[PDB]
Amino acid sequence: SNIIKQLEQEQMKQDVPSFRPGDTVEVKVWVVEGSKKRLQAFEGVVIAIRNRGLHSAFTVRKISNGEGVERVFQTHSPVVDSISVKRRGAVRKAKLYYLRERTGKAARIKERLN
Amino acid sequence: MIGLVGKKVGMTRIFTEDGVSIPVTVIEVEANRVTQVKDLANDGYRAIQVTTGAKKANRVTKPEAGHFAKAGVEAGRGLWEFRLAEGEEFTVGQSISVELFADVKKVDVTGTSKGKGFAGTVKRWNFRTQDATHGNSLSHRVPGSIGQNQTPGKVFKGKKMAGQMGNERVTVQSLDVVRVDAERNLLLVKGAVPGATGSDLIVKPAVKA
Amino acid sequence: MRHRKSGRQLNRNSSHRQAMFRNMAGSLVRHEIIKTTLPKAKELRRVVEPLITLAKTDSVANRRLAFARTRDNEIVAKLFNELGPRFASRAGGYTRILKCGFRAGDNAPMAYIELVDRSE
Amino acid sequence: MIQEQTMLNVADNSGARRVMCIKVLGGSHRRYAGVGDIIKITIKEAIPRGKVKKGDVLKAVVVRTKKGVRRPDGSVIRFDGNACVLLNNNSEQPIGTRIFGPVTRELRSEKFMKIISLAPEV
Amino acid sequence: AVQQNKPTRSKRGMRRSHDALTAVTSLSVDKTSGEKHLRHHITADGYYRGRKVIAK
RNA sequence: AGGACCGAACCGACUAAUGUUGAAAAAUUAGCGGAUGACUUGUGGCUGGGGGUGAAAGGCCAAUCAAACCGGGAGAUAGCU
RNA sequence: ACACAGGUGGUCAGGUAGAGAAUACCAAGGCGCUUGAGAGAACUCGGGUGAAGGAACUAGGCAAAAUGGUGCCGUAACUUC
RNA sequence: AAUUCCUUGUCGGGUAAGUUCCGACCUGCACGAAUGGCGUAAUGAUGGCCAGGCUGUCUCCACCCGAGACUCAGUGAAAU
RNA sequence: CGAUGUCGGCUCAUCACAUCCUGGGGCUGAAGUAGGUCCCAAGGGUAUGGCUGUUCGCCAUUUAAAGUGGUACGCGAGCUGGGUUUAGAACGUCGUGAGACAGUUCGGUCCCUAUCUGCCGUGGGCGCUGGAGAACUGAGGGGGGCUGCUCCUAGUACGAGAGGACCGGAGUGGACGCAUCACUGGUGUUCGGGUUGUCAUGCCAAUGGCACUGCCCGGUAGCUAAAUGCGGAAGAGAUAAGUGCUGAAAGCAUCUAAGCACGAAACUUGCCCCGAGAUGAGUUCUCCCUGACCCUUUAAGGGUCCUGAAGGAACGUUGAAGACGACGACGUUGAUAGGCCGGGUGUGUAAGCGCAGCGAUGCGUUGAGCUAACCGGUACUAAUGAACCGUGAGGCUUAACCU
């Protein structure tokens, strides 16, 4: 698959920041509303990262004014404009799906700081 | 028009500029090179026989090698044949490239599908399973009844029963061609085409309107 | 329907296969040539040859890592003391299978699997 | 992916608190409701002096699902809990005046424009 | 579930038309020992492709 | 204390699945009821065929029970096959 | 009837965890069940997991899933207390 | 009503919708007082109905682990 | 009656048309919208639930519609066993009673390893007239045909207004089918980790066995669906009902008698698949074989020697092919499988050692170690030289050419 490997890496964006699950992340996303092309922000804990080159996703979980939301993002989509890491987070797993069962003080991730 | 013989390289996606992922299948279409031209005056129908790829010298037999040697062409991995469309003209030894699809806008892709072996009627024919409990005695995935009673006292032809699913010619129609890349010899069509990776495809222009 | 799956099942469950290859790898390291069935030989390659390559690099973590697999201490003495420095330049291909007929008891296709030196 | 017999939460303040889906409208043998699809519901629980009382049968539109919606780039948006807004039965455009929680960009249509005029996110 | 007329010996042999065993079909001769063996197998003396192996 | 409670041995047999030319002429597996009592069990004894015994089902009386098994009357009789 | 997955009374009863003769892993001791080798189709049997939904199944929640310990708090109608 | 034919009686409760269920009425075809009447706490591998939880029961099946099934070697039935 | 299992449910159908929807059309007490009624039409489509054993029915909410029948009231060697209709028991009633009631109620064993036909798949033999390798045409056969809603045309036509089109076009759904794994997920007892009890490796540390994979948490490839692509068409021909044009018999009239034109999801094609056993066994291209000598009851006769081609088969390494055969790839002038190397992925920062802490533990080396089926390479191992099968120019007659 040098054809496919050569063909996908022509599309991979270069400046994707290094983040790992547990991190609070603001993701800025192009949202189109008719003619105006707005850019809105989705901040939450990374609970899952799939690395597959171009087909790399990451799931961000927010508790939005009420109930909880999980956006899975394709990392190399042109929709996903910015990824910035707000708070670096210290966890032990690789997929943090237990946090789907926890709210508030139980869903509280220590900071990494190294 | 005619088609070209490809090879299923696999699947990827193509992010558009406005952020719409398109699932594409990559089909490497090398130089299909014409080995025989068929006319009404000798065969009753106008068609070209092309070959593609390359074969080992010791693995091609003497009949086959004599055929490609007459054509004045390198031996490929197979011979295929395309029916011609009344105003088209090809010569023997002429090479045909993916550039032919630089106008076509939508194609039909024909391959052999993935062989699923002896399949039961729930996989094969989408029969619905009977109860998984409530008394049922050894008949969960079985086909049920297969016909009527004394009248007819036979099972009709083409009753859907279990047997070999997969591994047969299927044509997927009206796939949007996303890119034609004459440099790398590639054709990116939108969607899934039949076959496992590396399987030989046949990409023609779409006959539907 | 199996497509691209690797690994014979050998009419055993997973723990009996694991145990069986642990013993049979121990026997091939011990005696340097054993007679088994042809499928059990062909799976014994994929168990045995990784122990030789682990043995090509002697450290406490590889001795313990080759004692988790194989579970015998004489075996991880011969690996790391004899076989690992024996091959040492041989890149794969530590063992050959030689088909040798059929059993009498059940007509099974036997095969002698052996290490690839045995210059003694 | 809301089907019959499914208990949905209520996103507006119409008075209902917990509803059950009784049909998925819009086709024959249609199985699932979804992103912004209309269902028929019955009200299984209400607050004591809301506009809708217990055991009423009316329409609703699904605004959030646990299964989620897929965007055209491949990105999904799953919620935690299925939710609907109770539309009026005859001529739609819903009962309640507030809308709680977020909604999605796939109620961006004519009718549900009302629902996304409210609705603090998305 | 059981037959309804006894099948003949004709139909019986017709069914057994395929039960025939195929011969070996020719077994190969060793390079050094010059003795015969199945192909791709070792000989009775324990040679294979002209070199000595097992030796029990 | 208890025809007490939970629960093994022990006695049983409510459900399901398998089995149904069975591994088995009534079982196996997973759950199930009783489990100091009107309990359960070993060894011996007693009751016998229109008779026994029966917390009663026409149940049980040696894989047999609206009248055991064996032998005899007996080659019953059979306007029926 | 079988070298039969059944039946058969008493006696001895170690370790660790455990209330325990339950249960798990072990000791003494005894076994691997008298056809094997492959392959890894449908289908059947015994099991594991399952998106969203959660009895819509169905004669019927049959089956499965769930619950499950010890201590403490707390506990309604009704009652023969 | 373990009793009611007509009958899914009529009204009410539960349900989006209830021939079943609960309450009531009484025109009891064909209840009824030790072949007991009516109540009845506790009990029941008892019958019927409802709800919470729970789930592959199901929507609609998918994959996996094992034992057969399939191939090879040995033995080698049966009903008909 | 030396047994033809009988309701209902499930699974699986299949035909008829007296058509429920979709399609065409005539009359209308048809303005439009919506209808009523009748002719044509069988392509495809033609609910989910409450109650009840129920078919039915009533109800709730859908739908374009929820057709009517035949098929042993289709289907129990396909499933169930709720009902009817065994043996237990009770109620009401009948009988003095044993009992009895298609009155009611509770409980209650559904066997079969397929020989033949049929059907679904899949091979072996032989034929097709020398052998062999491929590519084909296509007789014929099968699959597929469903449809909503929104928008424009146009708030036009019609109508007093309310309301509201025909014909034509664009979009987007439902149900169904095919493919596929890029995405989202499921699984992933073969990968990594956490952790309980216990046993062992002498012991600490580290590991391993067993407890449903011990219980769990993630997860590669593959398979998959709830995932994502695509499909049902346009068009042509011959028509049904129907509408006509010209036109007599019948100096008018008249769609028909001569002649001519329209006309539907039905019909034949168009689309997809199988397909030369299509014994009517076809076509095209290519490849190979260019020896002698006897015998006779002189035949497309038999035999001996020498030759053994093209190719196939066997064997081996095997495969996104597979029950087995089959099919595909490769066999050393070689990446076919395994190993190995690099990468990726997954898990989540190994062991050892050092430091902090009384200790559990924490931190550093360290995103470390380990990584299955993945990807790119590499002859290290195994794919052996050979043998085997297959021959030696391919009948007769007639015709046209031998330029």
Tab-separated table of C-alpha atoms (C1' of nucleotides) in Angstrom, chain C residues 8 21 24 28 32-49 90 93-101 109-118, chain E residues 39-42 47-49 51 53-54, chain I residues 316-318 332 337-339 380-384:
chain	number	residue	atom	x	y	z
C	8	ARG	CA	-4.193	-23.365	13.870
C	21	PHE	CA	3.444	-25.501	22.757
C	24	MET	CA	6.860	-28.941	22.858
C	28	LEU	CA	12.755	-28.988	20.883
C	32	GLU	CA	17.210	-30.304	19.241
C	33	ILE	CA	15.094	-32.606	17.070
C	34	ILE	CA	11.635	-33.972	17.782
C	35	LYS	CA	9.112	-35.902	15.784
C	36	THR	CA	5.628	-34.504	15.875
C	37	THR	CA	2.700	-34.116	13.499
C	38	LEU	CA	3.125	-31.853	10.551
C	39	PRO	CA	0.608	-29.201	11.778
C	40	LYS	CA	2.091	-29.200	15.283
C	41	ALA	CA	5.494	-28.690	13.746
C	42	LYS	CA	4.271	-25.814	11.665
C	43	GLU	CA	2.850	-24.042	14.734
C	44	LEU	CA	5.851	-24.927	16.829
C	45	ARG	CA	7.953	-22.774	14.483
C	46	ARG	CA	5.920	-19.640	15.432
C	47	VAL	CA	6.312	-20.462	19.119
C	48	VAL	CA	9.985	-21.598	19.167
C	49	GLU	CA	11.715	-19.158	16.880
C	90	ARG	CA	21.186	-16.408	11.429
C	93	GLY	CA	15.018	-19.769	10.057
C	94	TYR	CA	16.206	-21.383	13.218
C	95	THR	CA	14.381	-24.629	12.519
C	96	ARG	CA	13.554	-26.974	9.687
C	97	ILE	CA	10.630	-29.346	9.148
C	98	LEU	CA	11.334	-32.692	7.419
C	99	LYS	CA	8.253	-34.725	6.470
C	100	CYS	CA	8.733	-38.360	7.426
C	101	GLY	CA	5.721	-40.420	6.701
C	109	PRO	CA	1.300	-37.064	8.604
C	110	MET	CA	4.342	-36.969	10.876
C	111	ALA	CA	7.391	-34.656	10.507
C	112	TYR	CA	10.715	-34.207	12.240
C	113	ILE	CA	11.190	-30.596	13.292
C	114	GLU	CA	14.808	-29.813	14.187
C	115	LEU	CA	17.109	-26.950	14.871
C	116	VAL	CA	19.043	-25.859	11.905
C	117	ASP	CA	22.586	-26.375	13.143
C	118	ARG	CA	22.968	-29.826	14.821
E	39	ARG	CA	8.407	-37.030	-2.743
E	40	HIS	CA	9.235	-34.267	-0.298
E	41	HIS	CA	9.616	-36.915	2.439
E	42	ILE	CA	12.664	-38.607	3.887
E	47	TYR	CA	18.095	-39.285	3.878
E	48	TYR	CA	16.586	-36.344	2.146
E	49	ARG	CA	17.809	-34.654	-0.991
E	51	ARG	CA	22.151	-35.583	2.613
E	53	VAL	CA	19.412	-36.478	8.312
E	54	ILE	CA	17.873	-38.216	11.255
I	316	G	C1'	5.288	-29.193	-2.051
I	317	U	C1'	4.672	-23.738	0.062
I	318	U	C1'	-0.240	-21.821	0.194
I	332	U	C1'	15.043	-21.277	-6.015
I	337	A	C1'	4.147	-19.644	3.722
I	338	G	C1'	7.037	-19.229	8.261
I	339	G	C1'	10.871	-16.687	10.645
I	380	C	C1'	17.426	-17.511	7.000
I	381	U	C1'	13.854	-22.254	6.813
I	382	A	C1'	10.695	-25.069	3.686
I	383	A	C1'	8.807	-24.973	-1.512
I	384	U	C1'	14.352	-31.285	-5.045
